[PDB]
Symmetry: D2
Amino acid sequence: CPLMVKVLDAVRGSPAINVAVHVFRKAADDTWEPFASGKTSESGELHGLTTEEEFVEGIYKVEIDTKSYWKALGISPFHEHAPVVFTANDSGPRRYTIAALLSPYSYSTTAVVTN
Amino acid sequence: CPLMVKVLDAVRGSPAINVAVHVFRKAADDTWEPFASGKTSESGELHGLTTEEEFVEGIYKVEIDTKSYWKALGISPFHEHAPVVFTANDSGPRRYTIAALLSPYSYSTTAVVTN
Amino acid sequence: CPLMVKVLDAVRGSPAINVAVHVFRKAADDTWEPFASGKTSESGELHGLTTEEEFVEGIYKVEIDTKSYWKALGISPFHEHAPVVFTANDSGPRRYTIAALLSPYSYSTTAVVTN
Amino acid sequence: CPLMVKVLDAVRGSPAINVAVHVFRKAADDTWEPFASGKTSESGELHGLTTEEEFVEGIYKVEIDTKSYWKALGISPFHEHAPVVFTANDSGPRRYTIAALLSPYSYSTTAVVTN
Ligand code: NA
Ligand code: NA
């Protein structure tokens, strides 16, 4: 698996558990088409979204459902969700980790791309 | 000025100048409709996107064109752009500052909402 | 105003008001000597810490008292404080803004340095 | 091992490899005393700093040597280092991960405390 998502909670100092994540790929007609989805584990990680066979070059969007996460914790959030948009390029062997750090009114995202 | 955008460059420790920003608002048909756009100034700020009259309740997307910013500096970055999605003016008018802090493979965004 | 400090609260999406800040400068004996201090205003900013005359070359530490800020809000945070350590004015005078974005278990700090 | 350090590089989109990390504990005389140290691995992680026996309650400082990291990559940095200061409390079983995300003029740190 070439694409992993990891989410942390900056208020509790914990992995962000049970966060829904939806991945889309841009189609030929320029629309976002569903590609993969899941919920983060107890470690805040989401593994097994795709395979090397299916994860071809293209433009992808990883949407982290931040609003539902904060509401389930009884906390008042700002954003609807956190979308992370990027091109996947076959510049040799690569693994992509989309990491995100969440606060109710702020978030950061980092791409960790390794060989 | 109920909606302002501020962008900083984390590599240089400076305002991110001439960054293009496109704002959209979700329409009744659920599509993203163009709402306003502009570019950041020498201070990294973008003022005058809208007015209290035009900035009605709704779901908005502020898209910061991070890829074009890094490419104009001769750098190949990871993300296509940084979209920031939120509901605005649902409890009456507020002033919103959407701030972003950019690095080639990472960004943070914060909302500062004042009454 | 060659040294300014700005602090935001990532939980509320607001300026962090009344945050204590202590600045130190490394002395010849390698100890941290008090240099200036103050508290952030209603805008989350702290102005007037020093003057161009007093702000000589040196190694400085800007300590943001994050624990006292969260405790005054009735929250038990992780960090004791957020120290920001850097050399200043080594290539002539510059204006420095030390910005910090706070959450109970996490913070970010950015330096904006202008000539 | 109850204390782990993880560092990412926001410019390259990679683990921050070979970063020196120095941990100190506050002594009875209020001075910072060396406690443990090491360099991050190829995964950007530093394991085996201490043991449950030695990691008693107290005030600790984890110093990440950011300036030397950026200089070894041929990149111009702002901060001397990134110090992370906190109390370790035996509120039941706990593991502490000090995570940091580095850019030349900005960094973030998050504490992930799990049971
Ligand atoms: Na406006
Ligand atoms: Na000043």
